[PDB]
Amino acid sequence: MEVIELNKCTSGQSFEVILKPPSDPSLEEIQKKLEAAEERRKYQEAELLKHLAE
Amino acid sequence: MRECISIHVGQAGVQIGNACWELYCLEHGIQPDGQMPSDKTIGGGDDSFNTFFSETGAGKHVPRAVFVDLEPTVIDEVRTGTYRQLFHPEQLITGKEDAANNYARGHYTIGKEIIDLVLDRIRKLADQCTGLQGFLVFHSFGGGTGSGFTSLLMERLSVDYGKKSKLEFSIYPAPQVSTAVVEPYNSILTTHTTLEHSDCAFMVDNEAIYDICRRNLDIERPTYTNLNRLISQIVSSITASLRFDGALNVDLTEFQTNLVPYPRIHFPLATYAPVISAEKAYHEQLSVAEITNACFEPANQMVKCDPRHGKYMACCLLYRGDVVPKDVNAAIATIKTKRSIQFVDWCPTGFKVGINYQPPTVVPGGDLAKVQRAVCMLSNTTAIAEAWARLDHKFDLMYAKRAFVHWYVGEGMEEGEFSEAREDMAALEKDYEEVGV
Amino acid sequence: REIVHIQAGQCGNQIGAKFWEVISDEHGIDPTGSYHGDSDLQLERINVYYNEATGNKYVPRAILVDLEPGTMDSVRSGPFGQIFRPDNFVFGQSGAGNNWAKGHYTEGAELVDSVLDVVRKESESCDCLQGFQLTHSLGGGTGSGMGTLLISKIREEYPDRIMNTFSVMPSPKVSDTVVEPYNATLSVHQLVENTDETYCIDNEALYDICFRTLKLTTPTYGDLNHLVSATMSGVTTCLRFPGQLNADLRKLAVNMVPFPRLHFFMPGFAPLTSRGSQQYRALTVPELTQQMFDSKNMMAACDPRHGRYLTVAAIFRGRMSMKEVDEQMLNVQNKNSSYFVEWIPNNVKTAVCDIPPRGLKMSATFIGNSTAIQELFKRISEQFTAMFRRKAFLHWYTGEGMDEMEFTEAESNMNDLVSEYQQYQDA
Amino acid sequence: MYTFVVRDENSSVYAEVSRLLLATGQWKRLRKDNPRFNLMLGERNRLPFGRLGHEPGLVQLVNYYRGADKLCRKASLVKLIKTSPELSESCTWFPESYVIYPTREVFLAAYNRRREGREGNVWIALISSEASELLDFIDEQGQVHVIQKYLEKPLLLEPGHRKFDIRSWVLVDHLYNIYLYREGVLRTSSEPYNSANFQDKTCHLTNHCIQKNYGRYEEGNEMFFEEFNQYLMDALNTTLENSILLQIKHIIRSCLMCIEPAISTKHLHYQSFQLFGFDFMVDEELKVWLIEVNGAPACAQKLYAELCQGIVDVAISSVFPLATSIFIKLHH
Ligand SMILES: Nc1nc2c(ncn2[C@@H]2O[C@H](COP(=O)(O)OP(=O)(O)OP(=O)(O)O)[C@@H](O)[C@H]2O)c(=O)[nH]1
Ligand SMILES: Nc1ncnc2c1ncn2[C@@H]1O[C@H](COP(=O)(O)OP(=O)(O)CP(=O)(O)O)[C@@H](O)[C@H]1O
Ligand SMILES: Nc1nc2c(ncn2[C@@H]2O[C@H](COP(=O)(O)OP(=O)(O)O)[C@@H](O)[C@H]2O)c(=O)[nH]1
Ligand SMILES: COc1ccc2c(c1)CCCN2c1nc(Cl)nc2cccnc12
Ligand SMILES: [Ca+2]
Ligand SMILES: [Mg+2]
Ligand SMILES: [Mg+2]
Ligand SMILES: [Mg+2]
């Protein structure tokens, strides 16, 4: 067990103990996704209103 | 000093943020009105606590925090509560109708209408920062807002803050306290969309927190207040190194370096000891050895799982109270001989230890007893994949019949997002399996 | 989160008025419209069902509809009749004659636009309208035919609001006319398309509960409506009272309805009580639980053991051990797990409200989405076909312009609903 | 009423345990995949331990110890004995063994010191004295297998000059009590042992199936303990208890106490028990050797009734109580 990088301050201390060594989408792509989903909602709602109009 | 902004999304995130900020104030000596007598540098400073608090000319210490919910009920309780003077009104953002427990409604329908407002309010806090580190995001997996809005917010934060770290505190769904039957859907959807945008995520299973409260606090039926005050203790242990002087985990970047050697396997297991009831008339104070040994008892973990049947990639011990390194190493030496602690072959077998001498603080009149020393272990063990296994199985049972799927498709989501999200999870389980056997 | 309430026809208005009596008592509101209550919990969510009038008087967000004035004159005469906004009384004079076609196509078409005007005025005053709840019968003409016409029109004007109904199913045991199976089958077709959640209140079950359990030899509509008002109070508990859940109609629909057409719930209540007879012994939590799951407490004459529960919502009311509630609720699931579909994990959810209903110290209300509800639709389907195979009594309908094809289509849709319920009973 | 599910339809033993449970009238069986069970009689491979102990209001129990395979796979067993200090410092009851992959340096180091000592140099995977002869078998097989010393001078029962192996059934309960069933069985060979012809099939491998001369000396080529004890008394002037069973009990305790920290469910959200089959060899000096451990053993037909009943009494009803013992508790 080797103790490493012992750092002490008034608030406490820290250190490391070793036992054994080793053996994004763009803003526009986002708004395209959000608006494609909104089209699908509006499409589904237009079908409902069309069915209700029949 | 480098600032950190906290973002609380949905009921779970908002209520856990209340608990955390209540605790933070008690730990730093900040009163409910924002005054901090011990702070002798008025109107500003670059002390360690300034990572989480900004300062007004009148000496007010205000959290670098934004609260967001798609419905106003819960943030209204903050707007009228004990700490109502702590937050500026513009950091408390609410809509009028929530996501109805529906990820798609939180991510697409309603979320698209409020994301830009939230980003502007976040931008207002970032402008007050001289060296913003990144964000700590609090949310549930199960809520429609906690799941759906969080993932939309995380995507945008990557766009607007590409260079900033993002940590998560995530509430994993448990039927003992859960509200909705569709939480497995929301959990899988939000994990898939958020995975690449989160650097490090601390999962808290409400089942684990619930049982700790029943067994160790003798609370027959814990409330959210019971669960959240306990959760705030663990969160405080984790963030103490950002708010206090010290050499370990001093910036968000260090959490990833110390706990996450692979990006996707970025879910460290938290274990905390001792949880002692305030009601007990006689209590025998637990030693360094006893609380360190409790870190390897599954009954003390934030997620119930069996680390003996996985492999470690990283392990931190975060002590608070009367602890000296000599006693830690003696305790670690004893524990190594008696416990099944296997590291992956490409990682050193060791503990990174940090000690804060101030013993944990407890909310007056709360359920936690005052203790002389406490510890929170952060370990990145493949054993946590059991929680993913549990969740994906429930997702599979429902999605095989397409049960409830029509509520998501009706909000503009496509059925294929379910299967895309589920195969990402399947990849995540396989990754944990490769690393773990 | 405002709800707009609508009651149509004789049955719709008789149970609708009883509903407003019972919950007005629970919220401490008198016939005056003034609040004379004891607890602030009674007023925290009073806005869900009541508008605030001048001088702090609460006016129900209720719209009273009928094609004849008789039952509505009775409502205005009734105990709480003065609490309703006079403008919300919308009525014709011709009557519907127990004829769905008259309610849906002819007489009701004349009146429906004036009802929609009052609905609009009530909606426009809402901070955030949740949706609508309708009280009606399916076996008459106005509540059945005009009620479903109203539902179709309300969905056209408010496509993104929730539509909830309390629908009374006809029974030959409590029967006004022989064409009730026609009216009901025509209505069920509309409900399957245009509501999100429908409480199936079966007059057959109400009769049997009054006869067999309550020991009432000759039950009246007043005795049946005592069971209805108690069930309506219970199932709206989590809408009217603050709790851990903060429930609303959409969250209820999302969690109770795995498939959009299978949204017909079996309600249940415990303890079963007859009118004006007080039970002095309270029920233990084990007893509340056992009865509320008992087929004898179901308001839809179906055998729950003949199907499987897709989802269940249970509300316990009174001062009791929530730990005991948790244990008992988990006990029935773990001891009868075969009757809960395995492919919806954790599909039984429980809520507790401290305030009990009037006259009880402990109550339990049950909301079941069970595939056994198909038994109710098969019953109506058989009565329908027994007359339709001979085109009997059809002239009452073809005289209002309907074609036999519309009956053939309605029969087919309901049989499809039946077979759809059967699909998940075997899965 | 207690609930249980069965996910290993091949289990002769737990087929009988399902019948016993149902017959009590206080156990109801559910479908394999219903999660609201008290007891899981689980599948042999990829049993989903991670999904156990998360059903609110259900004490859950399973008939397998997660991690017990480390003792029940020939390769893992060897590694466990070599690397565990609880065992290997001498470990005088396990045959020399080495793990070999087909795609060794330590193996030949001993094999050649036996060539130097002119000592017995027969080994097993399968039996032969020529390493190169069996290694050519190792690589043409393609999977991992061990190479351990073959016990050249066994104890042979007369009349027959036969060889045998001893199978002991041990149940470990949720509390980690170690229960050795008092009935063992000798799996006997009818073929007289031959020191010269190892490639000869049936005389050296005492497996029940492998003996398709079957049944000559005693029924089923199974000699139970009462007879074997009588033999040792008449023949060798000793008892089964003193000459063999003391060593067997020591070996069972040593193996299970070793892995106890890795597999115990004492503070776990679910519980485990497991029935094990220990297979032993006895040399001519009345010394007992552990051959292997079987994690899903089958019983002898004569004993199915008494043992499956004991599984219920000690391992199932201890946890789920209903409305002179057949085991010897091995203490630790
Ligand atoms: N630990 C803890 N869990 C909570 C809390 N509040 C809610 N939860 C859990 O979070 C899940 C429900 O998500 P919520 O946060 O309430 O939902 P939401 O984000 O507000 O989204 P909506 O569906 O729009 O209401 C369930 O699993 C709850 O048990 C809390 O205060 N503490
Ligand atoms: N080192 C060894 N020395 C002498 N004989 C051995 C031996 N290893 C095995 N044998 C003999 O070979 C037979 C089978 O070997 P082994 O026990 O390794 O596999 P197995 O067929 O028994 C699978 P299981 O034990 O699960 O039923 C044993 O019964 C034994 O007679
Ligand atoms: N439970 C109950 N059922 C009723 C009541 N009044 C009528 N019904 C039933 O409703 C059907 C007749 O419908 P009704 O409402 O009277 O016709 P409408 O006025 O045209 O809507 C029959 O099945 C009756 O049994 C009532 O007060 N309570
Ligand atoms: C099957 O799973 C469910 C079922 C119902 C509900 C939920 C989940 C989540 C919240 C909404 N909800 C409820 N809603 C309303 Cl009004 N009354 C309830 C009464 C009891 C239980 N539940 C609700
Ligand atoms: Ca300062
Ligand atoms: Mg919410
Ligand atoms: Mg009538
Ligand atoms: Mg074997």
PDB file of C-alpha atoms in Angstrom, chain C residues 308 330 333-335 337-340 342 346-347, chain D residues 1-3 30-31 34 36 38 55-58:
ATOM      1  CA  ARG C 308     -57.806 -10.030 -16.454  1.00  0.00           C
ATOM      2  CA  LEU C 330     -49.915  -5.946  -2.231  1.00  0.00           C
ATOM      3  CA  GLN C 333     -51.992  -8.810  -6.157  1.00  0.00           C
ATOM      4  CA  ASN C 334     -49.473 -11.351  -4.846  1.00  0.00           C
ATOM      5  CA  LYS C 335     -52.258 -13.779  -3.887  1.00  0.00           C
ATOM      6  CA  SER C 337     -51.489 -12.438  -9.578  1.00  0.00           C
ATOM      7  CA  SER C 338     -52.992 -14.579 -12.358  1.00  0.00           C
ATOM      8  CA  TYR C 339     -55.788 -12.004 -12.838  1.00  0.00           C
ATOM      9  CA  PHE C 340     -53.406  -9.101 -13.568  1.00  0.00           C
ATOM     10  CA  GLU C 342     -48.130  -9.882 -16.571  1.00  0.00           C
ATOM     11  CA  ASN C 346     -47.010  -2.888 -11.286  1.00  0.00           C
ATOM     12  CA  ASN C 347     -50.415  -2.092 -12.782  1.00  0.00           C
TER      13      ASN C 347
ATOM     14  CA  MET D   1     -50.359 -19.374   0.445  1.00  0.00           C
ATOM     15  CA  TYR D   2     -46.830 -19.332  -0.946  1.00  0.00           C
ATOM     16  CA  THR D   3     -46.041 -18.871  -4.629  1.00  0.00           C
ATOM     17  CA  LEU D  30     -47.295 -19.563 -11.232  1.00  0.00           C
ATOM     18  CA  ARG D  31     -46.116 -19.205 -14.829  1.00  0.00           C
ATOM     19  CA  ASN D  34     -44.794 -14.150 -13.372  1.00  0.00           C
ATOM     20  CA  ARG D  36     -44.778 -12.156  -7.994  1.00  0.00           C
ATOM     21  CA  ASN D  38     -41.844 -16.317  -3.277  1.00  0.00           C
ATOM     22  CA  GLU D  55     -40.794  -7.180  -5.550  1.00  0.00           C
ATOM     23  CA  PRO D  56     -42.268  -5.090  -2.697  1.00  0.00           C
ATOM     24  CA  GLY D  57     -44.025  -7.289  -0.167  1.00  0.00           C
ATOM     25  CA  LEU D  58     -42.465 -10.584  -1.306  1.00  0.00           C
TER      26      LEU D  58
END
